[PDB]
From a paper:
Broadly neutralizing antibodies (bnAbs) targeting the hemagglutinin (HA) stem of influenza A viruses (IAV) tend to be effective against either group 1 or group 2 viral diversity. In rarer cases, intergroup protective bnAbs can be generated by human antibody paratopes that accommodate the conserved glycan differences between the group 1 and group 2 stems.
We show that this mutation alone enables cross-group protection by providing a flexible fulcrum to pivot the antibody and accommodate the conserved glycosylation differences between the group 1 and 2 HA stems. We found that for all antibodies, N55T strengthened germline-encoded antibody affinity to group 2 HA and also enabled binding to group 1 HAs, which was otherwise undetectable with the UCA. N55T provides a ‘fulcrum release’ to accommodate conserved group 1 N-glycans, enabling dual recognition of group 1 and group 2 stems. We find that N55T driven flexibility enables dual recognition of group 1 HA through a mechanism we term ‘fulcrum release’. Here the group 1 IAV N-glycans at positions N289, N278, and N33 from the neighboring protomer interact with the antibody LC, tilting the antibody contact angle backward. This flexibility around the QxxV fulcrum is underscored by our finding that N55 forms more hydrogen bonds with the other residues within CDRH2/3 loops (S52, N57, and Q102), while T55 showed fewer interactions with those residues. Hence, this single vaccine-selected mutation could alone enable cross-group protection from IAV.
Author numbering:
A (entry chain B), B (entry chain D), C (entry chain F): 10 to 173
D (entry chain C), E (entry chain A), F (entry chain E): 11 to 333
G (entry chain H): 22 to 128
H (entry chain G): 2 to 126
Write the structure that this text describes.
Amino acid sequence: IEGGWTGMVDGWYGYHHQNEQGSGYAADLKSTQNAIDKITNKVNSVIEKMNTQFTAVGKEFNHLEKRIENLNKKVDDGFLDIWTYNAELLVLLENERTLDYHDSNVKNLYEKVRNQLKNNAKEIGNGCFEFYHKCDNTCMESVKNGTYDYPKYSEEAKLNREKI
Amino acid sequence: IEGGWTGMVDGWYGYHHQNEQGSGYAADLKSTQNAIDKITNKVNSVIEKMNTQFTAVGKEFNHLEKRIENLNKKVDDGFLDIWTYNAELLVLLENERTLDYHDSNVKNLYEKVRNQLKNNAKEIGNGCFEFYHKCDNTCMESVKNGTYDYPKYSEEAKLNREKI
Amino acid sequence: IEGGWTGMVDGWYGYHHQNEQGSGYAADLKSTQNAIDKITNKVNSVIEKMNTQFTAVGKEFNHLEKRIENLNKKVDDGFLDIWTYNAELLVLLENERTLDYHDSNVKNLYEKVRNQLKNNAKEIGNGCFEFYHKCDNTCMESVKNGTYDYPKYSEEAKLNREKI
Amino acid sequence: DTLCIGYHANNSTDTVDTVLEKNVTVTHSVNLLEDKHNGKLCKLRGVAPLHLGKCNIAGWILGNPECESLSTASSWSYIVETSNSDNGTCYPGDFINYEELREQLSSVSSFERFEIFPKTSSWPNHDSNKGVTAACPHAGAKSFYKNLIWLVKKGNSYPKLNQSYINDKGKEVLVLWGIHHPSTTADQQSLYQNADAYVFVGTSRYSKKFKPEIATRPKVRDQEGRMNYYWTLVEPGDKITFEATGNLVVPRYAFTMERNAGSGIIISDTPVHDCNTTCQTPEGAINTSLPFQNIHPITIGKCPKYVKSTKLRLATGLRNVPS
Amino acid sequence: DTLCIGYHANNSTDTVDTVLEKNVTVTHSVNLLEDKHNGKLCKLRGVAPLHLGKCNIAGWILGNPECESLSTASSWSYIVETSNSDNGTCYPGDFINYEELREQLSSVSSFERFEIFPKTSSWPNHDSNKGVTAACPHAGAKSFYKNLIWLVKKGNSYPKLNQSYINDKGKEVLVLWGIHHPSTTADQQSLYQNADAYVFVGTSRYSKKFKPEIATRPKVRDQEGRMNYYWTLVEPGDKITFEATGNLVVPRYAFTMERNAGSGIIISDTPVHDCNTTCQTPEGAINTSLPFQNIHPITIGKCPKYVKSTKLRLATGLRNVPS
Amino acid sequence: DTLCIGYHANNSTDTVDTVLEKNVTVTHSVNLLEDKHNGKLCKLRGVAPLHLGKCNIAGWILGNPECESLSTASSWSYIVETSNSDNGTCYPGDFINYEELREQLSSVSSFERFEIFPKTSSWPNHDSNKGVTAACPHAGAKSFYKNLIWLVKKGNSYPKLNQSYINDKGKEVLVLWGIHHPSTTADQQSLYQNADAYVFVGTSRYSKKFKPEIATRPKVRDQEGRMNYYWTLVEPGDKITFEATGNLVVPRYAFTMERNAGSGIIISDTPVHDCNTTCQTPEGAINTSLPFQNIHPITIGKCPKYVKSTKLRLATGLRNVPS
Amino acid sequence: IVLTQSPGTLSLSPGERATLSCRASQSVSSSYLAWYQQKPGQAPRLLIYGASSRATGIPDRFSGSGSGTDFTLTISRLEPEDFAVYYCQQYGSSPRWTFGQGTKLEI
Amino acid sequence: VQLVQSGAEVKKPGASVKVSCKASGYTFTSYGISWVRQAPGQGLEWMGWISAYTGNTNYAQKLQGRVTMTTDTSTSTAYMELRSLRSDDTAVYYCARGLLQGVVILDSYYYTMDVWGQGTTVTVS
Ligand SMILES: *[C@@H]1O[C@H](CO)[C@@H](O)[C@H](O)[C@H]1NC(C)=O
Ligand SMILES: *[C@@H]1O[C@H](CO)[C@@H](O)[C@H](O)[C@H]1NC(C)=O
Ligand SMILES: *[C@@H]1O[C@H](CO)[C@@H](O)[C@H](O)[C@H]1NC(C)=O
Ligand SMILES: *[C@@H]1O[C@H](CO)[C@@H](O)[C@H](O)[C@H]1NC(C)=O
Ligand SMILES: *[C@@H]1O[C@H](CO)[C@@H](O)[C@H](O)[C@H]1NC(C)=O
Ligand SMILES: *[C@@H]1O[C@H](CO)[C@@H](O)[C@H](O)[C@H]1NC(C)=O
Ligand SMILES: *[C@@H]1O[C@H](CO)[C@@H](O)[C@H](O)[C@H]1NC(C)=O
Ligand SMILES: *[C@@H]1O[C@H](CO)[C@@H](O)[C@H](O)[C@H]1NC(C)=O
Ligand SMILES: *[C@@H]1O[C@H](CO)[C@@H](O)[C@H](O)[C@H]1NC(C)=O
Ligand SMILES: *[C@@H]1O[C@H](CO)[C@@H](O)[C@H](O)[C@H]1NC(C)=O
Ligand SMILES: *[C@@H]1O[C@H](CO)[C@@H](O)[C@H](O)[C@H]1NC(C)=O
Ligand SMILES: *[C@@H]1O[C@H](CO)[C@@H](O)[C@H](O)[C@H]1NC(C)=O
Ligand SMILES: *[C@@H]1O[C@H](CO)[C@@H](O)[C@H](O)[C@H]1NC(C)=O
Ligand SMILES: *[C@@H]1O[C@H](CO)[C@@H](O)[C@H](O)[C@H]1NC(C)=O
Ligand SMILES: *[C@@H]1O[C@H](CO)[C@@H](O)[C@H](O)[C@H]1NC(C)=O
Ligand SMILES: *[C@@H]1O[C@H](CO)[C@@H](O)[C@H](O)[C@H]1NC(C)=O
Ligand SMILES: *[C@@H]1O[C@H](CO)[C@@H](O)[C@H](O)[C@H]1NC(C)=O
């Protein structure tokens, strides 16, 4: 979480693994799919909620209808100010929302990992975890998918904690 | 914190009692009432803050004022487009905040009971805690009231450490 | 967390320092400055993004242009309602976010300390921490500066935990 | 012993949308959009509207014979016309500044009709018992407007009219009149004396000279001539005068009115019933405090803003997730 | 024996502004503001535009001889007028309700030019070949408008004209006409025998009598006299009557028009090409579904609300931090 | 050895409202709604306003004797009129297109007065020294407008006027004139020769013929006759002519003007002080930078948007809860 | 971000308008621009704080303006002290300032 | 109120130079301190900014790695270390009060350099 990974093929969130069998990056498919669908719905909502009716903006008035021309200009300028102000604030607030949304999603993924590894891994705090027990590709994939069963290893980590 | 409770009709937030001396659902009435007061003020703020004047919309024009009738139509369509777009975004944004607000509050109760129980209960992660110590109804009531006298339970935890 | 401090002289976020060698209220300089700069940009975005043109409002109309005069009133009234309604919600929404934003930073500071100490101090639960080990002012500054190591006095803290 | 923290579930199926996901089910919600109406028209701020089932504003103000049965109220908040109401102008013609009059009459705090120039004493030198058009008969009687009378030559002579009225009331006075435009010179002489006619009408603020436009026109209501209808307001304390040599339709009745507010005109076939509302929509009155409605863009009163959307519902409760 | 959690990054340069900080680099973004156009005008609703090129709306609608190079179309999406559209009304004058006519002409679903009064048989008592002016040249010779003709005395006599057209079509008919105002009395007497003359035009709803205003005026386009141009719509089943004793310019052609008033008037010097868009802007047509555009305040069709902001880029990805 | 995490508390009493809670005390806040004004009027954009005081705009523009003393500025940012504005037209009458003149004069880049038709030599054939009225005397002198002169017959003869102004200046020229409508025919003959007469005024742009409308009218001030006031703009190089035998009130002075970006007219009794401001309000100059104001929405200039809400304040600090 | 001074006041006499202007390479907020005066031999001083206003201990003759990318100083009347080099100060989004080229007025 | 620069000195290429700026008349830690370089001729190009309150710094991108600043708040003096001086770097450096810290900035004034020092006139040859 301390920096972006330029080596990832796809996905907004994922994992890096360092092991004896291999090392590399992989996407978190469930989290990335959920974030992609929610952001796509957010964008589609922003586009879809506007439905302009067929209009003809701009009216021509003669020399002796100057007050009317100024009224039409007043209307166009007022709508211009409302739309510009609202569009600027909508985009700025939405961008603030998106960036906090992404940080919340990655922190929530981090906490889920803490929930599975609460007593099996050393927390570093820089986005990394270090296993006390030896973990092969199967338990690592289980952590990625979820449902890792803590009791299977248990006391071995305690002895490594005892050594540390 | 996963699904809801079908039997809880006395409030939005609460506790699940599972004891040989009794069982059932009970609301946290201070937290629930706080949620009610803030949501009611929220809806009243949305409703009451719109300025309403005694006005008249819609005007009749003759066959030589089509340009002006079209100007009035443009004004009505502009206001209609602004109000629909702003109302749709206000409803969607506020509903996202309402649901996130409620999830924040239920997490807040989870965190608060964690801080009261400390090391006297095992977290499950599905919204449930399994007590190691035997807690009588009144003992539970003390947990929900935020007055859990931790030092008098640790003496039993000393025996429970021989089971873990 | 649970309330503010009237003892701070310069700053928004900070720490209470109680040590045998001295006592005071030392502000969190980096976090306060980052939060203030972000709030400054927030307020300046709200104020500066208003697009103002050199205009004039208010028009004189003839007895036989009452239909147009009320249209001008209608336009002004419509803009008034929009400007009132959005402004109220903008202020209310910004204030809500501002307060949550500030609360997040203080919670972040709590977490900043918590993750740094790595079980080298007793968490009180009232927003305060009581150190298990003896911590000098240099140690205190290391915590304030964000460069404090749990190993440096780790064994002593464990002994003080056993003394419980 | 297990203690769980969680939230309640409900059998409610209320569905709301959010920014990130759609069709979110909640246990409690409130609406901002009102999609219901009474289906009835009623009094606004305690004063009943003026309802003209067959007559339009032109008919009622001019006094079209089909308007005799309409009740006259001392005040209205708005005027209601039906979609089949077209029994307006009798003699073919066009009101000048018609829409301005229609909007100005939309709200009156005190409205009274009075006889401004008594039919039996104001014009002893003219025949006030003729001026029959045969275009808008009442039970076959061929009757003319009730509020205006159309003067014709007494018999081979048309003495010059010179009339005046002083507005001795404290409220504005609405005075109506018309100018007749015969289709031919022979008809000008048959109906009025002196083919070269002048009409002048004026007040302290308003002053206008009129002439006839004598020409053959397309037939409307089986008559090839035309009438123009004019109106003016007389401020309290002023004077209104009429001067004419012919072709002037003089008022008999005039209206005293105190204007006090803006309001509009509702075109609707909805029946009128006694109810207490704050906003009147052509579809029917509404009974709500909600910020939005999707009933009609055209409303009168302190109405919710019109939104082109199916639903605006805010969640107030929790996401509904079954056990 | 370790794992790390983090977010993806790429070689993105998209800059996104936020409430708290500006110029944030993101891995993905969506641009909600269209700032591109194709530089050309195009079809709207699938119907070709009417492109005047060099002609004014007045010039085309009156049949200005310089505009003969343009063919009409049965349907219009909008009218394109250029910055060089100087060839408007030939004879010095003032076109009354010209802007309203321009609004009525903005789009028509079915438009055809009908010969309302054929020259051969419509004016057997008047000379329909004279009336050409130096102020409306064509091929180096004096000419006149093709849709209107200017009648003059045929035999040192100007018999009273009485003509009418019955609208036997199912669509409204737009009828144009005008009135000549000679420079001095001698010019009217030479041009028209009656000297004291009137022009009357009317329909069921429209009735107006005009009179020449003879006066010496500033010289415009080598002539002192002026023409006034008028127009009216005839609803199906109605008729138009032209009754005049002189100084009347009468139509030869009139148009049948099924109006669609939704569209406006566009000013642009760019050519029209073949494509299908939903909104046309003077700089060019756009093809977008995005909420905002910053191209021009004046657009015709279903387009994004013009915004003065440089960019409204909405983030979809996370913050890009190489590390 | 204790550390505790918390935040600053202060003595501030600023109370800020939010969505979830009302009346929240905050340590620091920023006001968005400006509710103060200088209480005096000042020079918008640093350019002095034209202050008419008691005199209306018609009076000053026509040279009303009561407000002859008003100075003329070469430029105006806006026009200040008092609530007790009077002495506008000084002879009973009504300006046509009055509001259009008022709107066009609201902001002028260059404004200079010149004598268009010098009184001494422009009309040797008419008596220019009897064009006076008792309706608007100057110190009881029975005088008339300073910018217009009223010509009457001389020696029981009224030769036809054939006057013109070439307009060889580079800026638009505002020319004003009027038409007199005597109370009766006897006054027309006593004051003017030729009871049947016309007045024609025109340019290339404008061409209009007027005829006297003679009738007895309600008395206003001490006279029954009325005057109508007209104005035109004369384009550079566009000759304006006045051809008349009737009741033409010829101009004496005319104004050379170039219009600035449009502004408005403010009606206020607030005294004028010499200072500069970003924005002018009827209650006084406002020079704030905040996005909103609650001062009367008839502002002139670029200004904060008007809202009805009593207070708009954003939080910047933390909720102030001492402990 | 850069600015171009494009000076048009290289040589002029006292008593006449110095129509000096500055162009920004990008549109900026008016609150982030300032104009400085430096007399050779003396330290520089601030003249204008923002395109729209002046609030310092300086004669009323110095009054600037500007918007977007186009900003002007337009000092209404010159004097002997007045002829000195002029600078544009532009604040960015980061706590960083950039300057234009400036120009000297020849007496 | 005033900013006082240290005395001028002449250095040879490859050395490092310490430049001091003493501030007085106002609360030192409310305002940041900036440095601006002025070579003979040309014009002002910005050298750097240091937040006196927080210790945050910002330097020109093309000069990154050779300019470091510190502030001593007990003596109320700011220090600049200029590494690897070259002969083209002869210039008069000015000290100025910059963006203030600790409160919300609504006015445009505080984004400017109001008080300037005399200049250290450092010569490199
Ligand atoms: C809850 O605790 C408070 C003190 O914090 C006490 O006054 C109150 O009586 C307690 N309530 C219950 C039900 O235990
Ligand atoms: C303050 O924090 C920085 C962070 O890089 C560190 O380098 C510095 O030594 C710290 N100062 C202390 C502990 O005095
Ligand atoms: C929910 O159950 C209650 C019975 O407690 C019933 O009255 C109510 O109508 C039910 N609502 C729905 C939507 O099923
Ligand atoms: C939401 O539910 C309705 C039925 O109540 C259905 O018609 C609609 O398609 C659903 N939309 C989505 C996005 O699931
Ligand atoms: C409410 O109804 C009563 C019925 O007697 C009526 O007198 C009153 O004026 C009404 N008020 C409003 C505001 O409609
Ligand atoms: C009223 O309108 C109907 C509509 O068909 C018409 O037949 C009838 O003659 C009209 N009567 C009057 C009096 O206008
Ligand atoms: C509106 O609702 C109120 C109840 O709040 C009721 O008393 C009133 O009669 C209703 N009026 C109408 C017109 O429905
Ligand atoms: C960004 O990196 C990808 C890697 O495949 C490359 O294809 C793309 O061209 C790069 N973009 C630019 C602008 O160089
Ligand atoms: C954003 O910052 C980067 C950093 O180098 C810069 O290259 C880019 O031009 C900046 N963009 C804007 C719009 O300030
Ligand atoms: C789209 O444009 C083509 C011309 O390229 C045209 O033939 C087609 O009819 C257009 N589509 C519609 C729906 O008109
Ligand atoms: C058409 O415009 C040109 C513009 O130079 C003009 O010379 C020409 O006379 C115009 N044609 C007519 C018929 O007025
Ligand atoms: C409009 O944009 C869509 C987006 O994919 C594209 O497929 C379509 O061809 C475009 N049409 C035109 C006429 O540019
Ligand atoms: C708060 O205390 C400070 C102490 O300097 C004082 O200046 C300020 O006016 C006080 N504010 C209030 C609201 O009492
Ligand atoms: C807020 O406090 C003020 C007193 O300072 C009081 O008059 C006002 O009514 C309060 N408003 C609310 C909503 O509590
Ligand atoms: C202009 O603003 C200043 C505050 O910066 C204020 O002191 C002054 O009185 C204002 N002038 C006017 C005319 O409002
Ligand atoms: C600002 O007001 C003063 C008042 O003395 C005046 O001298 C100065 O010229 C005004 N500013 C401008 C730009 O005119
Ligand atoms: C100006 O108006 C006042 C108001 O009654 C009047 O007394 C005075 O005679 C008028 N003077 C002129 C010249 O109109």
